[PDB]
Structure 1
Amino acid sequence: MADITLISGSTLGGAEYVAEHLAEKLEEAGFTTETLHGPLLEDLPASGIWLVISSTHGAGDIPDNLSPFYEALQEQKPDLSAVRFGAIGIGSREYDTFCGAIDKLEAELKNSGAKQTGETLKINILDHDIPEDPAEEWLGSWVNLLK
């Protein structure tokens, strides 16, 4: 049981460690969360809050990066107009628009109806990776905006 699904599984696997840290900070913010590698694509329905925790930029695999999830999104394009999402760790944004437009992932969610709120959250720990720099300040902003 959660108010937010933490969909953390680019290739049916992903940054579950970072998603668990995010999930804990989101429960501390006053909510309940479900750290998942998206085993059902959408454990919470097309209503509520979603978050998507993937690394589409310098580690975005060949097709797009989200091999099962992207095809599943296009297959059903559910009425996400009653939910909002936040991309996290994703680098497609504005900034790795660089060899193509793998922003397709964000675009198809927005087409299906989920507003992106704020802008893509950036996460980092121990060793530099893809978005380079943590954004607990995004988490504070996005929370006090949604309150």
Structure 2
Amino acid sequence: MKVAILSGSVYGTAEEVARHAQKLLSAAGLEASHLPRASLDELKAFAPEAFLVVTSTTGMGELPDNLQPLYYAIRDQLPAWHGLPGGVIGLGDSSYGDTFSGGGEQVRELFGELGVREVLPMLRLDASETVTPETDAEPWLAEFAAALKG
């Protein structure tokens, strides 16, 4: 089962979470790949059977520059990914006021528009409560793999 792992990151934190996710899901036997700065061409070639998106939110409450263009491309083209399983990890900070993971929510909305089935609730990782987001994502990732396998 091919799992496309997408990331949105300003300073690399969500990207490191995504890379961690790739190793864990691959360890579980999934054909998981992290595709940073992926294009529609790359996803088409990959032919994903599942999606994991790991994204922060910018200070302006938008998806980061390395996920926003792809987001718009997917929304505009709407590939026939209806029914495929998906999950979202949202990196926020309640200190800043991003208590909800804005970028993450926008991805959830895109899943709805595509017909991608959210298999787990979004993981909300908050900098005001953790400094080890990779490690903290592990229990959710364990359940996520179970949802795919599964």
* Both proteins in one fold, TM over 0.5: yes
Distance change >3 Å, CA 142–CA 40, structure 1 → 2 = same
> More strand per residue: 1 or 2?
2
Instruction: Report how many aligned residue pairs link the two structures.
Output: 135
| Contact 2:79–2:114 under 8 Å retained in 1 | yes
Structure-1 separation of matches of 2:80 and 2:24: 29
Distance change >3 Å, CA 5–CA 116, structure 1 → 2 = same
Q: Residues 48-68 of structure 1: CA distance to partner in whole angstroms, max 9, x if unpaired? A: 011111113xxx353631421
Task: List 4+ stretches of structure 1 deviating above 6 A.
Answer: none
| Structure with larger RCO (C-alpha < 8 A, sep 6+) | 2
Gaps of 5+ in 2: 93-97
Structure-1 separation of matches of 2:71 and 2:38: 14
Partner secondary structure for residue 84 of structure 2: strand
- Equivalent position of 2:95 in the other structure: none
Partner secondary structure for residue 5 of structure 1: strand
Whether 2:99 is the aligned partner of 1:96: answer yes
What's the TM-score, normalizing by structure 1?
0.69
- Equivalent position of 1:34 in the other structure: 33
Q: Which amino acid aligns with 1:106?
A: R
Whether 2:67 is the aligned partner of 1:69: answer no
Distance change >3 Å, CA 53–CA 64, structure 1 → 2 = same
Structure-1 separation of matches of 2:123 and 2:30: 18
- Equivalent position of 1:128 in the other structure: 131
Structure-1 separation of matches of 2:103 and 2:33: 30
| Contact 1:121–1:139 under 8 Å retained in 2 | no
| Shift of residue 70, structure 1, vs aligned partner | 2.6
Partner secondary structure for residue 80 of structure 2: coil
| Shift of residue 72, structure 1, vs aligned partner | 1.2
| Shift of residue 101, structure 1, vs aligned partner | 9.1
Distance change >3 Å, CA 74–CA 61, structure 1 → 2 = farther
Gaps of 5+ in 1: none
> More helix per residue: 1 or 2?
2
Q: Which amino acid aligns with 2:23?
A: E
Structure-2 separation of matches of 1:119 and 1:74: 21
The 5 A counterparts of 1:46-125 are 48-56=49-57, 60-62=58-60, 64-65=62-63, 66-90=67-91, 96-97=99-100, 103-122=105-124
Give me the identity figure in percent: 29
Distance change >3 Å, CA 70–CA 14, structure 1 → 2 = farther
Query: RMSD across aligned C-alpha pairs, in angstroms?
Result: 3.5
